[PDB]
Amino acid sequence: AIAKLQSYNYSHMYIRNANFDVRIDDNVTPETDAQWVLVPGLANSGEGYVSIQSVDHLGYYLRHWNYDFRLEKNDGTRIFAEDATFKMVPGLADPSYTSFQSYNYPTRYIRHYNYLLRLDEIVTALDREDATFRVID
């Protein structure tokens, strides 16, 4: 499914590709920078696992490299797949929304740190809000 990923706590902002960097922003141009294909997890086909593919750069996925995020072309490896697969879980700040738990670092979640996208431990209530997104498809 093609989706937009809206920040729970900054609801005018969306996860977007910015010349292969990853950030949240409002007023996203081109609009396809903010559009993603949620596909079955590259590292696991089971229920709830997803990989997040860029719409305007097919074959490119949100991939964490340690705790940073990049939009990277799939090199076919299991390690890439694991760094690019997330469990979609009920929102940490509000279960009606969505959070993205890392497949290979299960205590870490996708979160925006200000405008940047990171894979962090989620300790505080603000961390939970930074790690919660509305999936709009």
Residue numbers in the entry: 7 to 143
Quote from the publication.
We solved high-resolution crystal structures of full-length AtAbf43C and its individual carbohydrate binding module family 42 (CBM42) and GH43 domains, including a structure with L-arabinofuranose molecules bound to the CBM42. Taken together, we demonstrate through structural and functional characterization that AtAbf43C is an active arabinofuranosidase, specialized in degrading AOSs to arabinose in an exo manner.
At the optimal pH and temperature, AtAbf43C and AtAbf43C_GH43 had specific activities of 4.95 ± 0.28 U/mg and 5.67 ± 0.63 U/mg, respectively, on pNPAra, while AtAbf43C_CBM42 showed no activity on pNPAra, with U defined as mM/s of released pNP. In the previous study of this CBM42 by Ribeiro et al., residues D39, D91, and D136 were individually altered to alanine. While versions with the D91A and D136A substitutions showed significantly decreased binding affinity for arabinoxylan and arabinose relative to the wildtype protein, the D39A mutation, which corresponds to the α pocket, did not significantly affect binding.
